[PDB]
């Protein structure tokens, strides 16, 4: 049905190996860079997280049975709610491992400025909102980085896997198949040329005999 020609195809399939092997060489160290730096961000992430998780909650959990009627008061003095449509600051960024968007969680929420209410807890709960915001930026960058480094990792293992099967020995067997048929064609050459020789000698053998 669809079968490869020998003479036309030859020159394409020899440069096929040149093109492939070199391309894949550098393709290799292309993602390697990006994963080495990625360890750096995942580790560093949680640094702020242990520190500020606990000092947020410090006041929160100590303002639940002194709240549920001082809930009103606390929300009043403080800076009103973050917008539900893009209260966060979304950033777009094109990078290898496809176009993945990032973002940083910084918005207003105030701190140490609610008037009236519980002496200590009110103000301490308001201040705590910062320790959500700030802390959240770390996870804001690593969970979006996670989706980028997903793309790379998967495409990487894909190409290796694929290459060692369909591609590489296939781009081989093409030269081989070609070769062998070019070669074998030249049996008929020699056989014909043989019989040609036989004629020639047979002709000069009628001058001197029969």
């Amino acid at each position: 049905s669809q079968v490869s020609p020998t003479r036309m195809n030859l020159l394409q399939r020899r440069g096929q190996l040149r093109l492939a092997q070199k391309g894949v060489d550098l393709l290799k160290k292309k993602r390697d860079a990006l994963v080495a730096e990625f360890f750096g961000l995942v580790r560093e992430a949680m640094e702020a997280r242990k520190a500020l998780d606990q000092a947020a909650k410090e006041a929160y959990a100590a303002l639940l049975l002194a709240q549920a009627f001082d809930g009103p008061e606390v929300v009043a003095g403080a800076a009103l709610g973050v917008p539900p449509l893009e209260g966060v600051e979304a950033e777009v960024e094109n990078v290898w491992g496809s176009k993945v968007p990032r973002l940083k969680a910084t918005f207003p929420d105030g701190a140490l400025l609610s008037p009236v209410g519980t002496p200590a807890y009110t103000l301490e709960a308001s201040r705590a909102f910062r320790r959500y915001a700030e802390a959240l930026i770390r996870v804001a960058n690593t969970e979006t980085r996670l989706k980028k480094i997903g793309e790379e990792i998967k495409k990487t293992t894909r190409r290796v896997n694929a290459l060692e099967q369909v591609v590489i020995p296939g781009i081989r067997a093409q030269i081989r198949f070609i070769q062998q048929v070019l070669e074998q064609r030249e049996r008929e050459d020699t056989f014909r040329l043989k019989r040609i020789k036989g004629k020639i000698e047979a002709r000069e053998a009628e001058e001197e005999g029969g």
Binding site: G150, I153, K154, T157, R158, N161
Partner: protein, 114 residues
């Protein structure tokens, strides 16, 4: 010995064999081993292609059968196994696959060796 049966294909597989001409379950355990390994090695293709996986929990059992058939069965050194010893223990690796997901072996033989 390294024998891979997946590119292997024989001419007869129910001739010179049958109930009492070899063992009653020889004929049964033939086709069984074949499609069982198959569905193991198959997965190991598709894992690279997407994520680091390509399996559920209903794939994970056929998965261990490609390890099980491996160094336990295929490998043996040069030790002589008997026609008994072969199929007998071939049913201890077939305990790891669900018996309700077997379709290449008959049910009356499930009750003879489990």
């Amino acid at each position: 010995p390294p024998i891979d049966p997946l590119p292997s294909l024989s001419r007869l597989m129910n001739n010179g064999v049958g109930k009492g001409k070899t063992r009653e379950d020889h004929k049964q355990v033939s086709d069984q081993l074949y499609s069982a390994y198959a569905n193991g090695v198959d997965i190991r293709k598709l894992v690279a292609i997407i994520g680091e996986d390509a399996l559920t929990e209903n794939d994970r059992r056929y998965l261990q059968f490609a390890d099980a058939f491996e160094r336990f069965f295929i490998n043996q050194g040069q030790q002589n196994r008997s026609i008994e010893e072969s199929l007998q223990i071939a049913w201890a690796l077939l305990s790891m696959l669900p018996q309700g997901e077997l379709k290449r072996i008959s049910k009356d033989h499930i009750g003879k060796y489990y």
